[PDB]
Amino acid sequence: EKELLEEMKHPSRARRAKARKRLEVVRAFLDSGNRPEWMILEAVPVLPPDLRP
């Protein structure tokens, strides 16, 4: 987040726009408490059998 904030001060509009996209994702994980490695599955949930009868 600190590095992306520093890039947000770059005078190029494209650089600021790209940094904003990354920092929105970064701040979403920070505020919600979600842990980024949870986007990779180690255990796959199995739907209850009556919902797949």
Binding site: W38, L41, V44, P45, V46, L47, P48, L51
Partner: protein, 48 residues
């Protein structure tokens, strides 16, 4: 019995949606005014 119908409860389709969302590795939880989890499954899906 000649009585008025009672107050309704949560639809079973919403329960299906929550479980299907959980099958997508998404933690969908219903909360109350105080952000505490509320069990809409009547304790039938809680492990002890």
């Amino acid at each position: 019995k000649g009585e008025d119908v009672p107050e309704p409860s949560v639809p079973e389709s919403f329960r299906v949606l929550v479980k299907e969302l959980q099958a997508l590795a998404l933690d969908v939880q219903t909360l109350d005014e105080k952000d505490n989890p509320v069990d809409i499954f009547e304790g039938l899906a809680s492990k002890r």
